[PDB]
Amino acid sequence: VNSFSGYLKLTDNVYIKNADIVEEAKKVKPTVVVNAANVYLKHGGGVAGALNKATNNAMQVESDDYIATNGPLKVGGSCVLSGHNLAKHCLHVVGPNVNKGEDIQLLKSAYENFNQHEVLLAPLLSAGIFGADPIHSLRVCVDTVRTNVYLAVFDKNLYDKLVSSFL
Ligand SMILES: O=C(Nc1ccc(C(=O)N[C@@H]2c3ccccc3CC[C@@H]2C(=O)O)cc1)NC1CC1
């Protein structure tokens, strides 16, 4: 049993809710919150900009030190950093950004990072301002992630569309 409340069960291991991942993280304090990161860990907009704002920019400060030491991530890759006031850890995962012309096939590799964590709170990778189809992202998620994932969907109309079209 875990403390994720009001989620709709999609499969054995994937659950979904219309909610602000910022509020969900603050409330549940999950072991892992997933950030929709870019390779430079520049948290400017969308999930990344929101999670960073909620940390009072501490996420960005930590991220800048990470990049200075290690260099950029790979598209499809990830790193584990602090969750600050939101979670124990933040898994920064880079899905392909279609608005940058990146290869959507890398979305499966991006979701494979979730399998290293037994339970996660997460957004849809490559969706929103990353430019890919959100129905597609949910499908890749369910077909790739085997660990327990709680997907918080910010946009109410998108949430309704995702539930109603889920196969
Ligand atoms: O800004 C705040 N949260 C906050 C800000 C931005 C987001 C965000 O970009 N979400 C994405 C998104 C957005 C629109 C349409 C589709 C998608 C799909 C991917 C992702 C998702 O929802 O899975 C989420 C939360 N909170 C403070 C109170 C205002």
From Swiss-Prot:
Membrane association type: Multi-pass membrane protein
Compartments, record wording: Host endoplasmic reticulum membrane
Catalytic activity: Thiol-dependent hydrolysis of ester, thioester, amide, peptide and isopeptide bonds formed by the C-terminal Gly of ubiquitin (a 76-residue protein attached to proteins as an intracellular targeting signal)
Outcome reported for the amino acid change (mutating S164L): In strain: Gamma/P.1
Activity control, per UniProt: Inhibited in vitro by GRL-0617.
Domain Macro, residue spans: 1-167
Top-level division of the source organism's lineage: Viruses
Oligomer and partners: May form homohexamers. Interacts with N protein.
Functional note: Responsible for the cleavages located at the N-terminus of the replicase polyprotein. Participates together with nsp4 in the assembly of virally-induced cytoplasmic double-membrane vesicles necessary for viral replication. Antagonizes innate immune induction of type I interferon by blocking the phosphorylation, dimerization and subsequent nuclear translocation of host IRF3. Also prevents host NF-kappa-B signaling. In addition, PL-PRO possesses a deubiquitinating/deISGylating activity and processes both 'Lys-48'- and 'Lys-63'-linked polyubiquitin chains from cellular substrates.
Stated name of the protein: Papain-like protease nsp3
Organism: Severe acute respiratory syndrome coronavirus 2
Lineage: Viruses, Riboviria, Orthornavirae, Pisuviricota, Pisoniviricetes
Covered residues, full protein: 1025 to 1191 of 7096
